[PDB]
Amino acid sequence: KDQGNKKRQHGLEAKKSHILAARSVASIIKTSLGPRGLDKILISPDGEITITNDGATILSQMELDNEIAKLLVQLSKSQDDEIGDGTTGVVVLASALLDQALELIQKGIHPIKIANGFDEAAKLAISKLEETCDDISASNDELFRDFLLRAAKTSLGSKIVSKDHDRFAEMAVEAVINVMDKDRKDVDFDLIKMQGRVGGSISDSKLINGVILDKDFSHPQMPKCVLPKEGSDGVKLAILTCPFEPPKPKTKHKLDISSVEEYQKLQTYEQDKFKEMIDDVKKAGADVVICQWGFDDEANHLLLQNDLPAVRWVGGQELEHIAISTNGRIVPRFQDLSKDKLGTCSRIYEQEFGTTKDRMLIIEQSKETKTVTCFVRGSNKMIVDEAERALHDSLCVVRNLVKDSRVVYGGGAAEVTMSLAVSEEADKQRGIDQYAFRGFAQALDTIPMTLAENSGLDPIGTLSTLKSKQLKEKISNIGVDCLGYGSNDMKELFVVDPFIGKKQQILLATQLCRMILKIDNVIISGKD
């Protein structure tokens, strides 16, 4: 099928071509590794120019015909959710592993043995990391919170928000606390909604304990706010999914009035339906009517006369958020609405951010809730995007830190320690295992060298000094000058990376290397 314009490689150039393609893909974001990584210009087909050093963003927006590169990019897309901030490091490590595998194959080693040896080396490196890891939560709660805030600030400082990034870190920590419990120590990002718009400043960030529902209340005369009514039991919400209109035909409609009899009959039917719905709403005791669909003119008029602000076109996920925040339930229809299923919230009011005149509607609880929304604003679209990315990274880092008390330190110190351990263990295992361990150690050496290169330091001398310091004197956390630092020994600089994060990075790099190596034949057809 589609034999014409079909290309394939197998037996001679498959391995070399795949490894070269992987190296070329890696070189796209290799220079962007680290906080001071060089930026790349990304331009949309419409001509919108953007600047960012995020490896995940760079790879996601890149399309290509190479099969190995496409597979690597697709795997990175899935890994972005698992870690997020480690995509570039994982890609670089996989590229280094493939480069070493090239030499190993040139020496006569079968790919399966290379993959098995890399897996064993990854296991040994993870064991070494676990042995050398330190516990923060088991030392002091104050120190644990300080390290959480420090990680959030470090993530935020790489963007424009660095001027006032403290507020973003505090909001992220509060959202994680509200949404995550210690039973599982996992943050449910589905309950942490990310929303924002162009305008305002970085100081307009706000954490909401419920859904936003920035709606216009349908009818122009419909009140735009639901007040607590001077100390009353908050605001009662009618969670409904049935549209606030009587059944209508789907074929003709055109229910026009031609005489008195037809007018009377149609008015009787429609008014009876609307009165039934509005009476059910009133009996339920709800103060605000929320429907998954829109509202009819008669329904809007009746709600306005009864002082019942309306919310139109609320999505299913929004309804679930309403139920979670207000401890309510979703009522399929008006006839099933009762006071026992209405949700309660502190208030539904309009909130202004900076100079914004939209006056968006927000549902606020002011109490601890299982679902929150992270609101992000900024003077430019780039500011908002960077703030959202930094908030996501901070949330992931906090989740990783809380999930596992064991942590490692950045700047390549963990990579250097793993490389030293793997090199030491290599001489103990005979056969192809020795070559595999040496290759894995050399690949691990790539990350600190790349970081040093990105920081303007000599990778050779920097790596040699790091190895000497970590071997001759003692095992510690010594890395490269990723940022402006007085000296080395990140341990005193408080550059901490979660242990689970590093373990996931290593495992994903090994898996990607195996996936690329295990493909010995590629076939691609033509295009129409």
Binding site: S27, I28, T31, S32, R36, L38, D39, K40, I41, L42, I43, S44, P45, D46, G47, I49, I51, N53, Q61, M62, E63, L64, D65, N66, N140, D141, E142, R145, D146, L149, R150, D164, D166, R167, E170, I177, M180, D181, K182, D183, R184, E453, N454, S455, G456, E492, F494
Partner: protein, 517 residues
Amino acid sequence: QIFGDQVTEERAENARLSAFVGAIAVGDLVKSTLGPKGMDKLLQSASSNTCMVTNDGATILKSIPLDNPAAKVLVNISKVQDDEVGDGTTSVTVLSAELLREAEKLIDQSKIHPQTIIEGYRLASAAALDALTKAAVDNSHDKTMFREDLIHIAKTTLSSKILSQDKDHFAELATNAILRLKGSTNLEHIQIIKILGGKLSDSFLDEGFILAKKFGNNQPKRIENAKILIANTTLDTDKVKIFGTKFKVDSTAKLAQLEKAEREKMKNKIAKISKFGINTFINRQLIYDYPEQLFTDLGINSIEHADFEGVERLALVTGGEVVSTFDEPSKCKLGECDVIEEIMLGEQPFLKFSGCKAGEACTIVLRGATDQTLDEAERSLHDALSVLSQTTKETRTVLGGGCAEMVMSKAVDTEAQNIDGKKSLAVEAFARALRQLPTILADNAGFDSSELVSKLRSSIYNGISTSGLDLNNGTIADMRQLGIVESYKLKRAVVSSASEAAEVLLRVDNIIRARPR
């Protein structure tokens, strides 16, 4: 093949070559137009029926299409000059092009990532801006007339607002809140106190800094000779989230004991504060009874719930700092406050700070009838202060004819010596880029640019020299005697924009091809 739609990443060598050379080439479109004696440029349309000749740099840049993405980025970054000043776009573009050319030359001499070049450019720009600020002069003589104009402007702005209840009083308050600062006029230096129990006409003026939400349970109501340091520590409600955690305890008593031990663990950090010579402590979060007693034993005042805006303003007025941990004793920056008093305004607690070290701030107390009146008064005061602040931005001028630019270049050269060798080259490159402007000005004037530039450099280097370029006689003359001056704001904005534009492109490694339009 990568990406698509004619938008693909170029080879690293060619990508960097484009990023630098194409961006620099944008200056050539407007370099000839620099200065009043600049040349004219012809822009020809495809039909040739709408061609026109103009010497405006902004028009030339916005009219001529730029296919190279680097040129697009450079122009987009330089566009900030039009909004900030509305003039001098040609100077911004020329300075950015010269900085990029110097950075390219440095890279050709190093072949290393320009991050060190970026840092050197940042340092040189900071030094040049400091020198420019030092070289500026004030034309705000007869400050009484300026005060009268400010009063009139305030009265004009207060019209149709809630503050119209006492127009003269509020105009005087607004004028004072800007004039008495003797420095930055930003709203962060002006505090507004909103309380109920009176009329807006009864507003009081307080030069001191006032905060709300008084602190302490057993703390004194008066603090003298305070040594203020701000920290962000969780001294209250530790272990915020514990639901779902399994505790190896027989009863809740042991869990409470574990929490008490965790709270006690903070005693080391609490004690470390005393080693800094600190007698006043400010914490962003609340402070529990145990840490409060620990501070009391050390004789340190404990201030609670300082939040962020309060912390920032208190540090700014007292010149302090905010930290999260105490790594080493005796290593920190401490603020000072002569007297701190606990006061209540409108049945609401407040903290009064007096004698702040070099404090430059003012406070206005509003006595309203409801929330709407107080909010409207605050917004009207903010608008009036923003309008009045214009007087503190004008009248600031620097010597023209390249004198200020040459002084800035000399300052940068001086900075090039008290710096590491790996950055002295970048500092010298920034100085050369600054010096390029007078050379282009002389070239556009039709005179021997080299001779004039060398003479100006020698004169400026040789002490208290106010000489500059004489584009009318083609010689060197004293700018101060001739009264040739240029706006300080314009020069500062141009230099800052050029530095930012250079930094934007320096950090770029590769550039993706722009999609043709």
